[PDB]
Amino acid sequence: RRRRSVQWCAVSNPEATKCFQWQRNMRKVRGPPVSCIKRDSPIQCIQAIAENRADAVTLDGGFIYEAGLAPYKLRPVAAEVYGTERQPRTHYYAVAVVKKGGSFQLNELQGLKSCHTGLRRTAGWNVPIGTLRPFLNWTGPPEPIEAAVARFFSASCVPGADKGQFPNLCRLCAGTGENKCAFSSQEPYFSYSGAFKCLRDGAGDVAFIRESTVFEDLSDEAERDEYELLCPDNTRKPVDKFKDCHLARVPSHAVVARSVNGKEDAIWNLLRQAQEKFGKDKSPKFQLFGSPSGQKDLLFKDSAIGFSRVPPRIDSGLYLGSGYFTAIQNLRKSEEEVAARRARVVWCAVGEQELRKCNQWSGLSEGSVTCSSASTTEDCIALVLKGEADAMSLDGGYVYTAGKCGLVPVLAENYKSQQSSDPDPNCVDRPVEGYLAVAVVRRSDTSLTWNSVKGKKSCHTAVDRTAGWNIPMGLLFNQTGSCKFDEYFSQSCAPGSDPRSNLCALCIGDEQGENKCVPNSNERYYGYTGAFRCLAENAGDVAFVKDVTVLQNTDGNNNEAWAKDLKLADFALLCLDGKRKPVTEARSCHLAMAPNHAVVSRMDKVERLKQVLLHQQAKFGRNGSDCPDKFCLFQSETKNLLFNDNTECLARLHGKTTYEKYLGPQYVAGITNLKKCSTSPLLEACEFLRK
C-alpha cells in the first residue's frame, strides 16, 4: 500500500470535521484513502501544499490566481461542476443582488452599503470592483484600491479586509469580537450565503454573489420575488435572468495541487470515487456537496454536482481565461498603465532568432510593438490566450489550432499575385490567392513518383503545418485510413514529433547538434527552407514544401553553404497522377492550394493590432520608407522569421474573420479528420475551456 492517502487541507474546524468524516466514510467503502490537514486560511493551505504538508484544497478563482504565483505555483487539477446533470457547467455567474423597492442602478451605487463574499474573491470582489473601477476615482498604486472602495460605499462588509486601515470595509460585518470581518465561518456575512444574508438583514443595499445563492437560501418563489439583479446596462431584472443579467461569466472553483509532484492521479481517483459513492444524492451517510445546518460550502460548493478533470496543459492563468486573468492583474495597476498595455502589441516569437528580429523591430516601433517568446508555436498560442502576448503570424495549420482556442485571423500574408502586378500599390486590398503545396524530389531519382513515395525518407516543414504535414499526410491517410503516421515513411524529419520517433531521425538540430527535431528555426531542417535543405543534402528523398521554396534556394538565390550551387533543374515535382514535372510547372502539379499565413490575435486586440501593423508595414514593408535603409519586416535572409520573406504585404480578410471561414470548410474538415488520430495538449486544453 505505497500510497498512504491524499492530504486535504481544511481552512476551518467545521471543514476539518466534515473532512474527517469523509475519511472514514471512504475506507468504510474501501475506496481511496484521504487524510486531513488543519489550517486557518486559504493561503496557509496554499503554502502547506507548496511545501508538501498537504496535497489539495479547492479555491475560488481569485485564490486560484494567488495559488499560481511563485513560489507556490499550484495548478488547478479538477473543476467543480454546477448547474444540473441535464446541463452541467464548469463556470458560474457573478451578479449584483438588490431588494425590490429601490430604483438605483449599477451606476448609482455611490454612498450606498455593500455586502461582499470576501476580499480577493471572484464574485464578491474581483468582478464588482473591476466593474466599478471607473466610478472609484482611484489614482492607482501605491494607494490600495481598497481605500478607494472604502470611500465609494458609505459602508460595507468585505470579510478579510484590513479592519485597521479600512474599517469602513468592515463596518457592516456582523462577526463578534475579533471575528468581525474574519475571512471564515466565524463571520456570519462571509462567502455567498453570508453576503446574501447581509442583504436580507438590511445591513446592505447590494450583495455581490453568484447566481445560485438566491435559489439556494430561499426555498419559496414568493421570497425570491422580493429580489432583483443589477445588470451592467444599468437596468434591473428578475433573479432568474442571470444569463442575461450578470457582471461576468467566471470559471468554477477548482481543486488545486502542486505542479512538481502534485499526485494529480491520486486526487482525481479520490475525487472520481468520492463523487460516485457520496456524490449528489448518492449516499445518505455522508454527502460530499452538502453541509450541516449552521454551515455552508465546507470543502466544496454546496449543491455542486461533481468534478471535471482539468487537462495537463492548463496552468492557473489559462484556467482563469484571458478576460478574468488580466482583469485581476489590472486591479494592481494604474489606469495609465492599463491603457498603455491596451495600445501596445506584444508579438510572440518562436525561438531566439525570431526573438532577435522582433527586438530589432521593437526598438524601431516607437513604443507600439514589444516582444515575448516561447520555443514552440503552441506555447506562444498559450501566451496569447493568457494575455502575456497578443499576436503572431501563423501557417494555416496553426490558424486551425488558434481558432479552436478562440483566437481569430486579422490580416493575411499576401504573396506575388498569380502573375505580375508590379510592386502592387493596392496589395493591402488584393484578396489572397493561397500558395502551392508541392512535393519536391531530386531530378536524378527518376523512378520516384507519388505512387511510390510511401516507405521512403521524408522531409517536413513541421508537424501540423499545411504543405509540410496536413496536406501530404491527409492525402495518404485518406488512402490507408491508418493513424500510424510514423510508418508512412521509413524515417524523416518532421519537427515537432517525438525525438525517439522515426519522424525525427533525419533531423539534425542546430550546429552543436542540439535541439534535434525542435519545432523552431534552431533545428536546421525546420520550416520551408529547412525541409528543402533536408532534401538538398540527401537526408530525405522527398520534401513537402511550397513551390516558391525551391526557386528561392536555387540558382544563387540563396548564398549559403548547402545551397550556394543548387540549380532549379536538379529538382522535380511529384504530381498526383504519377507524372513528374519541373518546379516551374507547379501550377499544374501540386498536392493542393494552401491558405496564406495569417496574423491571429484575441478579439480584443483586433482593431488596435490592425492599425499598428498597417502603420508599421508602411514604414518597414516591401516598399516601405525605412526599408532597407533602417529595417525590413519581411526580410530575414531566407530564414522566414516572424513572416515569410516573400510577403508582399499584410492584407485584409474581406469578411473571412474566423478560422472556419479563412481556412475554408474543406481544409477544416480535412484537418479535423486528421486530428481524430491524435490531438495535442493545447487542443485538449482549449476544448476544455470552450465547453
- Between 248 and 287, how does the x/- string for binding to Ce ion read (CB under 5 A)? ----------------------------------------
Catalytic option among 5, 35, 154, 259: 259
- For 313-345, the DSSP string reads T--HHHHH-HHHHHHHHHTTS-HHHHHHHHHSE
- For 546-572, the DSSP string reads EHHHHHHTSTTSS-SGGGTT--GGGEE
Stretch that binds Ce ion, among 56-64, 257-265, 330-338, 569-577 (CB under 5 A): 56-64
- Between 375 and 414, how does the x/- string for binding to Ce ion read (CB under 5 A)? --------------------x-------------------
Residue identified by cell 462571509 is: 190
Catalytic option among 38, 73, 282, 454: 73
Binding of Ce ion by 521 (CB under 5 A): no
Stretch that binds Ce ion, among 116-124, 183-191, 361-369, 667-675 (CB under 5 A): 116-124
Residues marked as binding for hydrogencarbonate? Answer: 117, 121, 123-124, 461, 465, 467-468
Q: Which of 15, 55, 60, 464 binds Ce ion (CB under 5 A)?
A: 60
- As to burial, measured by CB atoms within 10 angstroms (0-12 exposed, 13-18 middle, 19+ buried), residue 398 is buried
Cβ nearer to Ce ion, comparing 12 with 365? 12
Amino acid present at 100: K
Could you tell me the smallest distance in angstroms from the CB atom of residue 209 to Ce ion?
9
Radius of gyration for the alpha carbons in the chain, expressed in angstroms and rounded: 29
Could you tell me the smallest distance in angstroms from the CB atom of residue 159 to Ce ion?
13
Amino acid present at 134: P
Could you tell me the smallest distance in angstroms from the CB atom of residue 643 to Ce ion?
12
Stretch that binds Ce ion, among 384-392, 461-469, 470-478, 629-637 (CB under 5 A): 461-469
Could you tell me the smallest distance in angstroms from the CB atom of residue 61 to Ce ion?
6
Stretch that binds Ce ion, among 164-172, 212-220, 446-454, 463-471 (CB under 5 A): 463-471
Distance CA 442, CA 102 (A): 81
**Count of residues in contact with Ce ion, rule CB under 5 A:** 5
The terminus-to-terminus CA distance of the chain in angstroms comes to 37
Q: Which of 25, 90, 122, 326 binds Ce ion (CB under 5 A)?
A: 122
Could you tell me the smallest distance in angstroms from the CB atom of residue 143 to Ce ion?
26
Cβ nearer to Ce ion, comparing 354 with 624? 354
Stretch that binds Ce ion, among 118-126, 128-136, 276-284, 635-643 (CB under 5 A): 118-126
Distance CA 497, CA 25 (A): 46
Could you tell me the smallest distance in angstroms from the CB atom of residue 94 to Ce ion?
8
CA dihedral 655→658→659→665, nearest 10 degrees, is -70
Identify residues 416-455 at the interface with Ce ion (CB under 5 A): none
Grid coordinates in use for 49? Answer: 501544499
Reported as type and span, the H/E element at residue 92 is strand 91-99
Strand partners of residue 481: none
Binding of Ce ion by 466 (CB under 5 A): yes
**What DSSP state is assigned to residue 391?**
B
Could you tell me the smallest distance in angstroms from the CB atom of residue 398 to Ce ion?
9
Residues marked as binding for Fe(3+)? Answer: 60, 92, 192, 253, 395, 435, 528, 597
Stretch that binds Ce ion, among 280-288, 467-475, 515-523, 582-590 (CB under 5 A): 467-475
Cβ nearer to Ce ion, comparing 315 with 547? 547
Residue identified by cell 505512387 is: 451
Question: Do residues 589 and 573 make contact, with C-beta atoms less than 8 angstroms apart?
Answer: yes
Cβ nearer to Ce ion, comparing 171 with 656? 656
Residue 230 to residues 153, 296, 531, Cα–Cα distance (Å)? 16, 25, 58
- Between 200 and 219, how does the x/- string for binding to Ce ion read (CB under 5 A)? --------------------
Of residues 553, 557, 554, 547, the one with CA closest to residue 584: 547
Cβ nearer to Ce ion, comparing 25 with 470? 470
- 636 as an active site residue: the answer is no
Could you tell me the smallest distance in angstroms from the CB atom of residue 653 to Ce ion?
17
Of residues 505, 578, 566, 515, the one with CA closest to residue 536: 566
Question: Do residues 304 and 81 make contact, with C-beta atoms less than 8 angstroms apart?
Answer: yes
Q: What does the longest C-alpha to C-alpha distance in the chain come to? A: 91
Question: Do residues 224 and 50 make contact, with C-beta atoms less than 8 angstroms apart?
Answer: no
Distance CA 232, CA 156 (A): 21
CA dihedral 255→261→265→270, nearest 10 degrees, is -50
- 456 as an active site residue: the answer is no
Distance CA 451, CA 533 (A): 23
DSSP-based three-state secondary structure for 450: helix
Query: Judging by DSSP bridges, how do beta strands 75-83 and 306-309 pair with one another?
Result: antiparallel
Could you tell me the smallest distance in angstroms from the CB atom of residue 168 to Ce ion?
24
Of residues 411, 472, 467, the one with CA closest to residue 435: 467
Binding of Ce ion by 529 (CB under 5 A): no
Could you tell me the smallest distance in angstroms from the CB atom of residue 124 to Ce ion?
7
Cβ nearer to Ce ion, comparing 316 with 466? 466
Cβ nearer to Ce ion, comparing 317 with 595? 595
Question: Do residues 274 and 280 make contact, with C-beta atoms less than 8 angstroms apart?
Answer: no
Cβ nearer to Ce ion, comparing 185 with 466? 466
Cβ nearer to Ce ion, comparing 205 with 547? 547
Residues marked as binding? Answer: 60, 92, 117, 121, 123-124, 192, 253, 395, 435, 461, 465, 467-468, 528, 597
Cβ nearer to Ce ion, comparing 34 with 467? 467
Stretch that binds Ce ion, among 197-205, 458-466, 495-503, 631-639 (CB under 5 A): 458-466
* Core vs surface per residue 358-396: b (16+ CB within 10 A) or e: beebbeebeebbbbbbbebbbbbbbbbbbbbbbbbbbbb
Stretch that binds Ce ion, among 117-125, 269-277, 286-294, 573-581 (CB under 5 A): 117-125
Count the neighbouring beta carbons within 10 Å of the beta carbon of residue 264: 20
**Which residues touch 57 (CB under 8 Å, ≥6 apart)?**
8, 9, 11, 42, 45, 46, 48, 49, 255, 256
Could you tell me the smallest distance in angstroms from the CB atom of residue 210 to Ce ion?
6
Active-site residue set: 73, 259
**Interface residue list for Ce ion (CB under 5 A):** 60, 122, 395, 466-467
